[PDB]
Design a protein around this ligand. Sequence first.
Ligand SMILES: [Zn+2]
Length: 259
Amino acid sequence: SHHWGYGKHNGPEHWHKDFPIAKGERQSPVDIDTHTAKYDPSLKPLSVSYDQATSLRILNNGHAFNVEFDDSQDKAVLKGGPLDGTYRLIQFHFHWGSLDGQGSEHTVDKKKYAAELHLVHWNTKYGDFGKAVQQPDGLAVLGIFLKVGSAKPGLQKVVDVLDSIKTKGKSADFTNFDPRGLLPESLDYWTYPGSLTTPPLLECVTWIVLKEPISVSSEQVLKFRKLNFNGEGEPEELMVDNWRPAQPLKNRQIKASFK
Ligand SMILES: [Zn+2]
């Protein structure tokens, strides 16, 4: 049967048939043109409070892998930056390529990074994630580019569990993971209003994309590429190129926290 994905017959160019908002006015990702983004001195420093984060599980959902967190209290939150109020971390995941020259969803002056990390947070004034994704300010996604170079120590625990969630629907306990180990040195960022980059493509996201990429080793990203989109007992389809390309900016402004 038919299901959205990243192949020739069900990839991003087809999604609009199931999810018409794919052609909407606030779709993500976008290209970040550094000569059109404007420094905004009213933007605050980003406040990342992850000390009390409680990771729970890692899941291969057939499109990527999600590391899930306990979001029943303000244990890992994002405040400040462009945001009003408090956004709780619910999960993170990555998008990556079959080759080092592709994989990111956002681009910077058309440059594509090897991968991109998305830390997904929801606005606590809406009570739960499901209600937050019915609101134009329901979500905040922190996006972090990955380039291939030196290894990222804080990523290694993720890499070393992937063998246990090779196929769609597999999960593994994944407690005591500290997402601070995935951050770059600088928290300078670009921000713009957009959407989920996977179906249902809902236009609920304040995007906060960090300027500084993190470095991961070739071996770390190679291990991402050994995952499978398929379920156990089905033909093997490597989980690679699970990225949506840049979408039209339309009537949107990208602001920079730095000059
Ligand atoms: Zn994503």
